[PDB]
């Protein structure tokens, strides 16, 4: 994953991605990458944190405690955020529990807010957990969409898959010089050789 494009040459605001230093990110590599995708109001972007408060990380997607991964949030006033209350991008609220880390909620049902349970017909209480985002490109500054991408690493006993140190320096010849080709290190002069290796 070419991490250079997102920090070295990027125009993405609020690149605070606690857990790993953005510098030399390409030189450190974890096991697997879990790409996320979110659309949040302008003010509610701060809710991405180790628990904190609010309607995010309590009923919405939750950030685990002591989590290691990077988070990015960039303004999306255009590119599928247009006039009228958008049909998509609706809340996830009114859950009996406070959710657990890393679990995904793809289930919808009428909430319970009283003694007797309504048998499927809405009325008193029994609130529908979902409400749509009523934003548009003519909103303020703290309410415009800010698409959030969360890159989740993993710390476990598994070998790292996404890697790649990159780095590059030129080659010299006929001069005593230090070399670190693939881990091996030594000192000496490098000359052209006629020996043939197997592929």
């Amino acid at each position: 994953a070419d991490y250079s494009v997102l920090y070295n040459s990027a125009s993405f605001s609020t690149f605070k991605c606690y857990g790993v230093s953005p510098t030399k990110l390409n030189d450190l590599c974890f096991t697997n990458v879990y790409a996320d995708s979110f659309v949040i109001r302008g003010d509610e972007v701060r809710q991405i944190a180790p628990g904190q408060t609010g309607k995010i990380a309590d009923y919405n997607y939750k950030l685990p405690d002591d989590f290691t991964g990077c988070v990015i949030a960039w303004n999306s006033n255009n590119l599928d955020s247009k006039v009228g209350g958008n049909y998509n991008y609706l809340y996830r609220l009114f859950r009996k529990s406070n959710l657990k880390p890393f679990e995904r909620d793809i289930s919808t049902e009428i909430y319970q807010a009283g003694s007797t349970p309504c048998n499927g017909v809405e009325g008193f209480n029994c609130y529908f957990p979902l409400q749509s985002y009523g934003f548009q490109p003519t909103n303020g500054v703290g309410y415009q969409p800010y698409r959030v991408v969360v890159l989740s690493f993993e710390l476990l006993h598994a070998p790292a898959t996404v890697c790649g140190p990159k780095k590059s320096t030129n080659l010299v010849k006929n001069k005593c010089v230090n070399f670190n080709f693939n881990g091996l290190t030594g000192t000496g002069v490098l000359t052209e050789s006629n020996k043939k290796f197997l592929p």
Partner: antibody, heavy 122, light 107 residues
């Protein structure tokens, strides 16, 4: 467990009106609010219900028009505006909300207020 | 939807009452979605029984009544003269959430 309402507002026959119900002592984030009508020596007419956790409301047969609610999530309040005020609207509006804390709560509307006193006179 | 018109009008007896009040309904309303408020002169109402299947958190005892869908009855059994004020039936579930006519009491 307390709920304080604004003072008696005096207005003109048909400009506007707005009433504030401050909710305290219970979790206002996930609850419901209702508004009714009262008078002297007269019955009670239900007006409109508000889920303050998520804005969804309907209104009585007399109150679909000239009536819309206002959320005002902050300050734990609830606003509700009436337009085209009529003479026979000298009413105490009141407000009610269930005692909710945690997500599942009591059914009956147990927490009430005291209401205002609006006089649409000259 | 509104044909409730609670049958009792004004009843006037000293304590020693076995009186009952009825909240008739147009259609059988599912229980536990009911309410029975108690308005007071110059004050705010209270709540006594939330759905004809239990009793509220804490309130004066010696009266608790329940009924069917079309006839949501209630009863009072020797209550003190302090609880002599206007009652109000109520319904939930179907919008609009309409109240009742109200019942009057006297000594």
């Amino acid at each position: 467990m307390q709920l304080v309402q604004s003072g008696p507002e005096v207005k003109k026959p048909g400009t506007s009106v707005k009433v504030s119900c401050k909710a305290s002592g219970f979790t206002f984030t996930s609850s419901a609010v209702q508004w009714v009508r009262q008078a002297r020596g007269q019955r009670l007419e239900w007006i409109g219900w508000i889920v303050v956790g998520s804005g969804n409301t309907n209104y009585a047969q007399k109150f679909q028009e000239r009536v819309t609610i206002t959320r005002d999530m902050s300050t734990s309040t609830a606003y509700m505006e009436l337009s085209s005020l009529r003479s026979e609207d000298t009413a105490v509006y009141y407000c009610a909300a269930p005692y909710c804390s945690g997500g599942s709560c009591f059914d009956g509307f147990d927490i009430w207020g005291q209401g205002t006193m609006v006089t649409v006179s000259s | 939807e509104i044909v409730l018109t609670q049958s009792p009008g004004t009843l006037s007896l000293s304590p020693g009452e076995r009186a009952t009040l009825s909240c008739r309904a147009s259609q059988s309303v599912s229980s536990s979605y009911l309410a029975w408020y108690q308005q007071k002169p110059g004050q705010a109402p209270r709540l006594l029984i939330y759905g004809a299947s239990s009793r509220a958190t804490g309130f004066p005892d010696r009266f608790s009544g329940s009924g069917s869908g079309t006839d949501f009855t209630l009863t009072i059994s020797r209550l003190e003269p302090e609880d002599f004020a206007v009652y109000y039936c109520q319904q939930y579930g179907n919008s609009p959430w309409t109240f009742g006519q109200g019942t009057k009491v006297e000594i």
